[PDB]
Design a protein around this ligand. Structure first.
Ligand SMILES: [Zn+2]
Lengths: 122, 223, 93, 61, 97, 61, 48, 223
RNA sequence: GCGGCGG
DNA sequence: CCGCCGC
């Protein structure tokens, strides 16, 4: 699952660069949450960008990011905007069955896992 | 009976370690603490700060370079460097390449006591014409430090990078039950370790255990 | 679950077929002696108190393990009923 | 969709999506209701279901 | 805190004094383990009595279960070697010995 | 002898146990549930010896 | 004889939560409070 | 800057132990393993077997004696004795009082080297013509042992009792923010141990630490 | 075969 | 449906 908090104001980074900076310092303040309704990316994605998949989880393990937080992560060929948790799930499945590619070919990390999303995965 | 310490290691990245039998719930008493250490204490390397001449912000795009600042600063986190001695606390890697060439990690100009065991690591693709020059700082630390925590300012206009110190990627341990003639309520500890290559799973484990030992001793003198 | 049960199923025209071959084969493993195998070299089954699965723990495990490879052949009427058991005793002590 | 082919879930999604458009109202399919084998039913007539998912193994109760 | 890891369990957890009871259900009435023994002298059933436990019934409800599986011998075994062929169960026992 | 060995003796410790655990190696047993309704009413599992009285069953089944 | 609680035994509260003992955990590693006091039993939330 | 192991010990029961500074999360890496050992591993003492003269079974009643055999033996497992040397593996305390009196653990006839820190423990209440003479067997062990597991038989008509060997009732550890250091992100582990009296807070801690070290070495010979 | 409980 | 306990 992903979390949503409080949108203290303006959610326009969809275009301003003083919106990446300002909205990112406003976040450092008490104004904009790490998970704000900010179209393209909530400050939550601006701050943390994780290269390798592992990179993401360690930050978690050190307390930087909760599993249910919206961050950005570089996977095999795409810069994906998904939470650690989701990604972790991907790994678990990709581990269960060695064909990692065929793994993500059959799972949807676009929604929290419901009994059905899993039913269908099985 | 004595803990049979079995080892199954392939390369310098993966290392399975089994150790049984153990008394009631000891596997957990060992594994977990080893883990916390293996990811927090182990010393290694990570790029701290980078600086591309013509670049200002973290989110941009250098002409002649398909990669975006972010994708590049990311690629660098992947870079694994290995120092040879204490005298090297902070080393600044330098690299400049132009034109129609692929920029690999081996293109950085060699440093005296530093070694790059992450050669073929893809850093950037420079198109027909494409000036790419920059200086990436590297340090020896422990654990993970967010680029917002340390904030290194070599070049006033440079950008801090998340510190990926532990040469250990992930740690996993399992406590399955094992049989010993008389009593079946037994622990069997197998801990699997993943490393970037700078050090091996086996060396890391030992260093860990040592570090725990060194701390156990600090309980010596009362007051 | 089981070792290459997928592969196994794909080698037979019918599920139950597999079982039968598997079984009867386990029978021959013990009847005509336990050396009537085909993959005893390096990479044969094994246990953990010692490495003694090399003699006679579970028969079927062998069968399947042997059938996973193109060593044995199974068919409706491959060899004349009685002649099979006579030749086997002769070449297996 | 050739003859005899055992239509998988996907293939039944297709047919539905197609009926949506308006290309098929019924479906020609083998079934026990019309098996010739006096005492028994064959592979092509029973179908895809098995404890598994591939076609039914002959010899199943 | 976990106790195994000493690390907390993210999120307050409710705890308290709850009054709970043990029921007249001991497992003493719940487990007979029979390898072989006494058989009825009228019908040939592994009935029990004193030293030998009884064998669970298999009913047709369960045979079907087996039939379906295609459990040929597993079913054969339940109706023969394990029940009526006095020479079957015999050979079986011996063989296993 | 082996039988008398199990007739009154309390444990048999590791060795009798070593043997049992050895005899069960790859064998499996069947399990049955109260009303046996469908074919899955009985499933086969590899036994892994354990302490006590209860029988450990897999959650998914 | 004395009936000590063991894995097969079944307990339950006055409200209706009925159940059997699955595992007898060593105080060593079971859910303890800030102050040394560990818990006695852990009920699965899902049955409520 | 080296873990300043401080101590505040009052009596033989309570015993706080403070140790800092420590590097980011080790207070917890140490705190829990030691806790898991302190409760499960530490050796101690407990009433292993008892024998009342005219009583044959555990479920009997003794004349002029309010409490039942079961109520008594129960109270005996609450008895905390303390030996002083290995030479004392199995001690048998003997006690016999009659008439109008209250039997308290102090009425045991002294056993020279071994002492009873559980004095006022109420053993029983005697009416008139209340004849109670019993021998209670004690041992030095580790963990929990069900009276059914050992089945001690000094006298053919004695009844074995349940074994409670952990000389600690509760362990607790805290990880406070700071003492000294360049960086504020530091751990200050203070653990407070509670003992029935048999051994001391410090004594336990040390044994614990040792059992931990002992296991650490078991990582020696690979295979 | 009558009665009581459990799933 | 199955398992037990008792006149
Ligand atoms: Zn047909």
């Amino acid at each position: 699952q992903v979390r949503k908090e409080k949108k203290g104001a303006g959610l326009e980074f969809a275009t301003p660069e003083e919106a990446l900076a300002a909205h990112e310092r406003g976040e450092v303040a008490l104004n904009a949450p790490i998970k704000v309704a900010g179209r393209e990316t909530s400050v939550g994605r601006l701050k943390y960008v994780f290269a390798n998949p592992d990179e993401a989880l360690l930050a978690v393990a050190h307390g930087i990011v909760d599993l249910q937080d919206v961050v950005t992560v570089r996977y095999m060929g795409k810069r994906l905007e998904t939470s650690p948790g989701r990604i972790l799930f991907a790994r678990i499945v990709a581990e269960a069955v060695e064909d990692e590619k065929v793994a993500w070919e059959l799972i949807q990390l676009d929604v929290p896992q419901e009994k059905n999303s899993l039913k269908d995965l099985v | 009976k004595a803990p049979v310490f079995t080892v199954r290691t392939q390369g310098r990245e993966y290392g399975e370690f089994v150790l049984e039998p153990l008394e009631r719930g000891f596997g957990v008493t060992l594994g977990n603490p080893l883990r916390r250490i293996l990811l927090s204490s182990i010393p290694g390397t990570a790029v701290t700060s980078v600086y591309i001449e013509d670049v200002l912000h973290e989110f941009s795009t250098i002409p002649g370079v398909k990669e975006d600042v972010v994708e590049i600063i990311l690629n660098l986190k992947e870079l694994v460097v290995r120092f040879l001695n204490p005298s090297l606390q902070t080393v600044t890697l330098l690299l400049k390449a132009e034109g129609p060439k692929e920029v690999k990690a081996r293109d950085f100009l060699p440093v005296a006591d530093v070694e790059i065991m992450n050669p073929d690591l893809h850093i950037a693709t420079l198109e027909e014409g494409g000036r790419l020059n920059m200086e990436v700082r590297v340090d020896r630390g422990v654990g993970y430090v967010p680029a917002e925590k340390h904030g290194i300012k070599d070049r006033i206009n440079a950008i801090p990078v998340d510190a990926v110190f532990s040469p250990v990627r992930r740690v996993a341990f399992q406590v399955e039950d094992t049989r010993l003639g008389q009593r079946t309520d037994l622990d069997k500890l197998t801990l699997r370790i993943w490393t970037d290559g700078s050090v091996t799973p086996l060396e890391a484990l030992n260093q860990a255990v040592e570090i725990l030992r060194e701390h156990l001793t600090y309980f010596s003198n009362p007051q | 679950a089981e070792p290459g049960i997928d592969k196994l199923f794909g080698m037979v025209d019918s599920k139950y077929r597999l079982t039968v071959v598997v079984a009867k084969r386990a029978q021959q493993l013990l009847r005509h002696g336990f050396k009537n195998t085909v993959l005893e070299p390096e990479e044969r089954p094994k246990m953990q108190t010692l490495e003694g699965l090399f003699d006679d723990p579970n028969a079927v495990t062998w069968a399947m393990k042997e059938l996973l490879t193109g060593r044995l052949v199974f068919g409706e009427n491959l060899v004349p009923e009685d002649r099979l058991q006579k030749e086997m005793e002769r070449l297996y002590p | 969709l050739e003859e005899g082919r055992y239509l998988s879930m996907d293939d039944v999604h297709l047919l539905i999506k197609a009926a949506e458009a308006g290309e098929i109202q019924e479906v020609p399919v083998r079934s026990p209701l019309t098996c010739q084998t006096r005492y028994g039913v064959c592979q092509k007539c029973y179908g895809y279901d098995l404890s598994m998912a591939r076609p039914v193994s002959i010899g199943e109760a | 805190y976990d106790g195994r890891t000493g690390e907390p369990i993210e999120g307050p957890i409710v705890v308290g004094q709850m009054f709970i009871m043990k029921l007249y259900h001991m497992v003493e009435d719940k487990m007979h383990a029979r390898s072989t023994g006494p058989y009825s002298l009228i019908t040939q059933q592994p009935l029990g009595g004193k030293a030998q436990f009884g064998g669970q019934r298999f009913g047709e409800m369960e045979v079907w279960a087996l039939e379906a599986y295609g459990a040929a011998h597993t079913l054969q075994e339940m109706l023969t070697l394990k029940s009526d062929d006095i020479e079957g169960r015999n050979a079986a026992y011996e063989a296993i010995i | 002898a082996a039988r008398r060995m199990l007739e009154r003796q309390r444990d048999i410790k590791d060795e009798v146990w070593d043997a049992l655990e050895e005899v069960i190696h790859g064998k499996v047993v069947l399990l049955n549930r109260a009303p046996t309704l469908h074919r899955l009413g009985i499933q086969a599992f590899q036994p892994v010896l354990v302490e006590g009285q209860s029988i450990q069953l897999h959650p998914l089944v | 004889q004395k009936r000590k609680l063991q894995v097969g035994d079944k307990l339950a509260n006055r409200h209706g939560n009925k159940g059997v003992v699955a595992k007898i955990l060593p105080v060593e590693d079971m859910p303890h409070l800030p102050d040394g006091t560990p818990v006695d039993v852990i009920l699965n939330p899902l049955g409520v």
